C-alpha cells in the first residue's frame, strides 16, 4: 500500500520525563514517554503506512534487541502495527480494520529510552518526535550514576543488550585507578539472579582504554571497535581469566594502573523473574601485614533487569 503520512494529524502531542518532571535518570531505569492523539483522513486501506521520526538521543527499545512498538488500537481492534525501520524511524502500517472507517482517531503511548551512545554526558537534551511536519518537543535533564569508588579505584557498569529470544545479555564494566595509585585486583562477574547452573561459559573480553579519563562516557558506553580508544587485551590476560558454566568469571590484574573495560556476553536461565549481574572488584593496597591483616577493599556494582512481576 502507500505512504499516507500526509493524512495523519497530531491533535495532541507531548513528551514527558520521569513522573512528569523535566528530568530523567536512565541508570535508575527511568525513561521519557511520548503521547500522541492522532486524527486520520478517511479512505485508508490495509498496508497503507505512516512514519514519524524521533531525535537520535532516544529510542524505543533501551537494552532490548527487539524492535517492536505498541499497536495502535481502536479499543480492541488493531488498526496499525509498528516497527522500527532505522534512524530513528517508526512506521505504522494499517490493518484491514481501517477499511471504510470514518473520523478515525487514536491514542499512542511510547516509552523513549535515553540512548547511551548518543547521550554520553549529563545535561539537557531536547527530545523530539516529528510526524507529518508537526514537531513535538521536550527538554529533559539527563543524569547518570558515577559508579562506586574509593581512594584507590572506581567501578561502574551497565547492561548493554538484552536478548529474550536467545536468553542472552551483554554488559559493560569500567574499572580504573584513582589518585595515581596502583593496586593489584581481582574482578568478578556473578549472576546473583538468573544463573543457569548448567549453561555455557560466558564470553568475556577486556580492553585497555587509550583516551583521557575525562572523556569516558558518563552514560557507560564503550565503542570497542574504535581502535584509537580501545585496545583489546583479552589474549594477553587469558591466563588470568577463569570462566564458569554458571555464568561467573574471575579476572586477576596485577597492576591496576590503567582504565579497563570488561565486556561480558552471557546467558541467563529461561524463566527467571529477574537477571541480576554483579561486578565486584577486590583490591589489595598493601601486603606487608605488619601489625595487622585485612582483605583490602571491595567495590560492588549490580545491574539488573525485571523480566516478570508478579
Numbering used by the authors: 194 to 503
Question: Which passages does the manuscript contain on this structure?
Answer:
The adjacent fibrinogen (Fg)- and fibronectin (Fn)-binding sites on Fn-binding protein A (FnBPA), a cell surface protein from Staphylococcus aureus, are implicated in the initiation and persistence of infection. The N-terminal region of FnBPA contains three subdomains N1–N3; N2N3 binds fibrinogen (Fg) and elastin. Here, we solved the structure of the N2N3 domains containing the Fg-binding site of FnBPA in the apo form and in complex with a Fg peptide. The Fg binding mechanism is similar to that of homologous bacterial proteins but without the requirement for “latch” strand residues.
However, only rFnBPA(189–505) produced diffracting crystals. The structure of rFnBPA(189–505) comprises two distinct β-strand-dominated domains, N2 and N3, connected by an eight-residue linker. The N-terminal N2 domain (residues 195–335) consists of nine β-strands arranged in a sandwich of four- and five-strand β-sheets. The N3 domain (residues 344–503) has a similar structure comprising two β-sheets, each formed by five β-strands. However, unlike N2, the two β-sheets within the N3 domain are linked by a short helix. The structures of both domains resemble a distorted β-barrel rather than a typical β-sandwich. The N2 domain adopts the DE variant of a C-type IgG fold (DEv-IgG) identified in other proteins including ClfA. The asymmetric unit comprises a single copy of rFnBPA(189–505); no density was observed for the N- and C-terminal residues (residues 189–194 and 504–505, respectively). In the apo-form, the G′ strand aligns anti-parallel to the neighboring F′ strand.
